[PDB]
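Notebook entry, structure prediction.
Reason for the run: the old model in the group folder had no record of what sequence produced it. Starting over properly, with the input documented here first.
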Amino acid sequence: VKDTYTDRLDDWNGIIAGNQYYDSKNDQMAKLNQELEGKVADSLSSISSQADRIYLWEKFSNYKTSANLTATYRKLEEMAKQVTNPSSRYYQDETVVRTVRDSMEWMHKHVYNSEKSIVGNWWDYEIGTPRAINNTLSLMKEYFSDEEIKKYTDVIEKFVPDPEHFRKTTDNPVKALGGNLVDMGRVKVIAGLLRKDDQEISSTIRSIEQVFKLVDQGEGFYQDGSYIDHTNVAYTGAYGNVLIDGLSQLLPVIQKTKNPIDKDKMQTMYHWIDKSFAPLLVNGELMDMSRGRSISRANSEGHVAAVEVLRGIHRIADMSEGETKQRLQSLVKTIVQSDSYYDVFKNLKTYKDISLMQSLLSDAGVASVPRTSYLSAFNKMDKTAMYNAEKGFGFGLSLFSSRTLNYEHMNKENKRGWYTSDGMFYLYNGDLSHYSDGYWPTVNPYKMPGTTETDAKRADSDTGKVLPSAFVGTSKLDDANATATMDFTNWNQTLTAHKSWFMLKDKIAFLGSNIQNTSTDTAATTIDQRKLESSNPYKVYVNDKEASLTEQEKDYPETQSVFLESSDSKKNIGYFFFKKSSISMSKALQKGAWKDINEGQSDKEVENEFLTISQAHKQNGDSYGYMLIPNVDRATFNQMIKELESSLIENNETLQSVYDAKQGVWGIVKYDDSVSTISNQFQVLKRGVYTIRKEGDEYKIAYYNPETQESAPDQEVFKKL
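New structure, fully documented this time:
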């Protein structure tokens, strides 16, 4: 029956596939159509026939493995897309129409119905498979009866009766929040439209409105831009992706139902984009520290993942107007145009998304200006993101605390993420491919960059932990200096370090003190583990003299500096040791498979060359301290390190501070409430984290207490001398 429900389903079809917008002369659209043609051809040649059948596809045949339900139904959705595309060779094809109908009936009677219970992953039973069924029925609604559509969605209502909860049919339900709550909309608003059910539509939209509230605790978006999911995991770049991607699809539909969402109540979306998402996007890449276990998926490296967010923004721009629309278009345009490594179209998977992106890129009225410098202190999820527009590098420094889980290993994914929040850092430079092309399966997981660890073996079966201490966080001065500590203890309480970072505009100081080890394992800090490009070799200098690195580790006692020199200055990396330090270095081919870190991935061997730099800590009370200086040439690095000769103010058990004389900026971390006198100019008075600027005779003060998550009045923490 044609009516206002089917009008909404037509709009949905325009969003999830966009056959109406297909243009055979549009090269990017034709490429996606060809991908879909081949998928459908492969499915048809492969499907089990005879007996009518007995499983549908051998590759997805064990129905106790719940991913096989979703993968099966997704094959049918692909058929529905092509059967309704006038330019497809399968357009209105009699075999395809009957194959979708027969396959729906077979799965209904044998695999997935209201008489079943969840076996394996609840997510397949409540989100993945329901989404695929809904979209199939929506696209092919002119080939199914209303009665058949009810029959094939009754199972969705068995598993997902309540728009406020997931896992309702299990003995242990969960409150629907975050990205999964948006998926609740793609399940229940669409099933409600298919089933002509006003109460389902209205109740589900009411439930989704929760997503617009900023939270003080628990899962969701915070005022400082943090996003938490799975109780206490930093997750903007995976679950937050689902939230923006899914909601941007649903909104044009919801807003034409009887129950539209209020404008002022949707205003929060622009907060997410500017505060939460934008800072985590560097040269088209979505920072891995925000993506949880998704880093272990070969098809979801950081520039691919970023497109989920970008397409969400561009859809939101399209539903906006005027200046808010142009500025959101301009944000997408400049991000895409900055990405010389990844082709955005490779992850635009509907014709309307392709069309919107093409419009944006060709419209000379939409500005594309390089983004300015920023520094986001995501204290509520223990991550920090920094970007310097003048020199063109990004830096990610994010951590964990008593408030947050270190890493997520779940559903057999991210088996070796053990040390990815132990003060791990990321550098985003002119090598846009660095964390891609198989970085995650080939990186040595025992030597994550920046981390101080012992060499004890770790079990793939381990799961994440919280940190004993709450003394973890960042004090930001400006919008562009800002800055951090972590009262670090390792996974088995055998090693400690006071680890601090001093973000000073064009460089970052790394200080570690109080390094202690009660184990018989050896301790060290990985200064770097950098993935190399064979096309762009580094010439390596130690103390400004060329060094030849080998697979075998070589020791360099009395090192003041290390310089990695590229033909491209925007790939150069320097390390300045404030005090001469004993380090070791190697350049080695590292091999691995994605299956090693994610049981569901390919076992094919991958390899990459890495340059590792380490500093051993053989004694209690050991220390490290060095300045990371990117994106300058060798002569300029050599001048800078002379400017910085006395930049290290203190690096002990109670006080760590670095001074940038050129800027007039100090970073300070105090672990106690002693009076600390700094540079014979002022005193700082309380345990916590400081970034201070002298401007003539005045001081600008940024203080943060990471444990109480509070600043303080200037007079409580600072005194000019």
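Summary: The chain has three domains: 379-635, 2-373, 636-720.
The old model has been moved to the deprecated folder.
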